[model samples]
Target chain A: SNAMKKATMLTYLEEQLEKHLGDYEVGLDWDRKNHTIEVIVRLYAENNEQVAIDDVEFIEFEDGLLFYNPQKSVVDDEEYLVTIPYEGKKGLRKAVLDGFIHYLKVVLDEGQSDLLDFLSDETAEVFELHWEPADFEAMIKKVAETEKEQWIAYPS
Target chain B: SNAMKKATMLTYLEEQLEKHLGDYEVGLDWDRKNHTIEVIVRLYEFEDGLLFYNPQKSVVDDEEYLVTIPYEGKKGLRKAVLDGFIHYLKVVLDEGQSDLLDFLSDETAEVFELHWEPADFEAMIKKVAETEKEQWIAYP
Candidate 1:
């Protein structure tokens, strides 16, 4: 049953994380001894290597995963970090997306507009969910021209 | 007219900056010819030392100060002030003085223009961290 539960959550995360592209690698780590699931997000350097920004991580239980640690997460193998709650599977999805959002904010605050361009057009729309930087559209075009080859793979 | 505008904006900044009180001398840099008002928030440490975080320049519209950068007004002032302080913390981290007070005494001069209390600065950084996390929940 635990393995089945893990498989179900992993599928949900893969689906949600699929909404964005080119920023992180999402995976699951099962801690059988502790009877828990560790969802990890390996943040890509091209998009999130701003000065002093840390990676993210989240641990999930049956009820949900709570967000604590206003402090930055330690960097692991050159990538970011993970989380879970509500429906455990849905929780995994939220935790993963939340990690990426943290990186996006770090990138923006560091005055690194260029990386914002790497976000797929569909994924860039996520900024619409929050107050975006002043030059949002301008930088999007810059990323489009430079990453022209990937245009066909715009996070469908 | 320029004097009136500067005076009004100054009043606004004084009130807003006071919301986050710390050891600092506040001043106004009024550019009459350019019709721009620059609110200078110079931070101070302990009794005399000065800290340094490069100044953040923002251009905010006269009528639209969105409390975000690129808009000149109260909002822009808030963002610029935070921007400068954040960079200051970066310097401390780069120098391996992660402890806020240690950086204050060991990394700064007796008299510097930029100064800040360790606790206040840390608290503000924490707020940004939480705000960013919450945004993801609301958006995603």
Candidate 2:
């Protein structure tokens, strides 16, 4: 039963990404110890971007860590931690980016420029997806530092 | 140019879906939209997970989306998307799934996702590629 529940959550996450994020490819990296699934999204840059932007590569290989403590699949203990590469459509990338933005609107009740700046900066790339509000800020900063301009984005 | 770009992205997306996602119905939806490609992924519901997810069918008969973005003269966009999908797999799945859990990762991903439009290639590529015309799209 527990295994099934965990599987459900993992598949739910997969479907979530697949619904919005798939234009090319999406994959998972499962952490046995952590009991979490990492989402990897592939966007091809070489095929037709050449015709559009000459030499501009639209998507590069990028990934992030997501932490979700799996309980025997009964009910989720809380939210899962997720790290995503910088993504865009011309200016937008990473489906998680949109998710984070949405969370901010609902959680904070007000949008702050400073917070937006931090999230927008690839420097602050990592984030936690737990249910607690206070922990969110800290975890985001932790992920950001885990890599540095290491967040998901096209190479300049 | 937009038409060319759309064709390229659609092609890359289909291949990447097969390579990483594992269900092989992607090719069936080629040129189904202007810039949009949609396919239904049906997965079996497990007690805690979805099991044996696969593609039942991919229907793309709308004439508007029917220009063959042939694999022979592929645009750079198509190549990039394919390369990008492969890169995404190495970065994400290979490290996490392949390293630890011994479950057939690709097998789990291989639950029958749609790949090509059965009709377009059936008339063009498949017809030329196959020696027996009777073997094409026998389902319909």
Candidate 3:
């Protein structure tokens, strides 16, 4: 139930795309002042729509509040083991955006496919004219069916 | 502004709308527990991307805690109410509900909030009611 609620916070289709496709310095701030979930994604180009997700990689959020360097070997890659103590709200949450589903699993507290189904539908709703209720599922399945030229950037 | 009943709320909105066309419940409320001001707009949906909102009722937030302050009087009050409505709009769309007015009418319900101050009234209205807060023109 709450999953659907959490999923809806993922507004802005372009931002969602940037978040999932990986290798972008993104910040998911809990905006203490406004009490709103702020999603920050840095674009590579001023004129280009495609994000420089992989090419330009310097992932440092809130200075060092949440750092996820995929280059490290000791790095779990699955978790953000380091969350420096900030103001309050213990344990900073940071993770890589290899894929939307993966991000859901790591950051949003995921369990399995059923959770993904509900969350996916809700996330798709925010896509507006570009995607419908089942559209997210369609994209996932499309990626599954064909990953030839699309190594990890199907939606990218 | 005093947290008005539905009737007075609707009338005030009509006056405001004539000066500028917009969509939002005339009603305003404040949530005591969360220390936030809430906004409620009852939209009647039809077909196409167009939603039909004449509104069967101008619903107000039941969580309101009645905030009364001088004109240009309080800033924190405004922020709390903004957060209240921000979060209200945040998830009030799970399709579970939005009929906060009737709930607020109950004495057993939580505290309340309001609208006052001369300067930011228009800014506040535009924030909660308008989809395009920037693209506003005086209705002359």
Candidate 4:
């Protein structure tokens, strides 16, 4: 149930995306503080189309202390692993770190299938997209620039 | 910084879209509990991408803690905001409602843009075909 509870967090993040970005919506969130850009999501809510996701990478401590990761991961590869020590809630939860990766796959696969169906008016073999690695690099670069208000070095 | 952070989250989400859905190379972290998908980046690097924008309606939350309804200004036609809250964990902190409408009605022009499969598919096709024997033969 705890796992599913955390899934609510994912649903929240997804809901945020749906609320902020629509069709043609890119990953960009406007932070109310500092009047500048950063790659983070607010747990609550704010104004301006400048915000993306508010939930940051937090480590819950004793007595409800939380530490947040200001910047997101930049490793341009598929499949990541995150280890969060269990303080009270679940007792050591390890995440696969492929949430977004999989989400993208789902939508893209669905769309690809839909487009094929729409265009061909016929069902095609069950095929999904493949990885290229380069695309990830480019996307990461683009995101860093948007949040920092300038381009960060692209991961080699 | 919050603005930029939000941007980062957006970028992160978009990157996830590429890797998970498109199968493009990008770090990813999935939350099975949260039913959320995260882009797996490096230790402290940030990522960014497009935030699909929509101009219509807003989200409303009820006392029941249920994310409820998209307000279309009681004037024009509005499509009901939809989200698959199959993961019951997201309903409320305590309430048993599994549906999270707030993620939609609260924000004007909800950011559920991962639905941009149209453009993504186009891009994916070119990349997928180039590396493999697959070909993109258009429908007749």
Once superposed on the true structure, which residue ranges of model 1 sit more than 4 Å away at CA?
Answer: A1-15, A18-156, B1-11, B15-140
Segments in model 3 whose C-alpha atoms lie over 4 Å from true places: A1-21, A46-133, A137-156, B1-140
Winner on lDDT between 2 and 3 is 2
**CAPRI level of candidate 4:** incorrect
Sort candidate 3 into its docking category.
incorrect
Q: What does candidate 4's lDDT look like per residue over B14-127, in tens digits?
A: 543454444223343433232223333221122322211111211111122112211112222111111111111112111311122434466664542112222433344354
- Chain B, TM-score, each prediction? 0.31, 0.24, 0.21, 0.20
For model 2 chain A, give the 10-residue run with minimal summed lDDT: A69-78
lDDT of 1 by residue, A1-156 (tens): 354233344344455445543354445554433334454433332433332323322211111122211121111111212221122222323333334344433443442342344342334432211224334334444444544322111010
True contacts kept of each: 0.00, 0.00, 0.00, 0.00
Worst 10 residues of 3 chain B by lDDT: B47-56
lDDT of 3 by residue, A1-156 (tens): 354322222233235545563554556654334222334433221213332233342222221112211111111211232321111222112112123334332332222222333333544332101112143344445445544332211110
Model 3 alpha-carbon miss at residue A37, Å? 1.7
In order, candidate lDDTs are: 0.34, 0.34, 0.30, 0.28
Q: For residues A107-150, what per-residue lDDT tens digits would candidate 2 score against the true structure?
A: 33322333343344556553322234344445455445555332
Candidate 4: regions farther than 4 A off:
A1-12, A20-110, A113-124, A129-132, A149-156, B1-140
DockQ for every prediction shown: 0.02, 0.01, 0.02, 0.01
lDDT of 2: 0.34
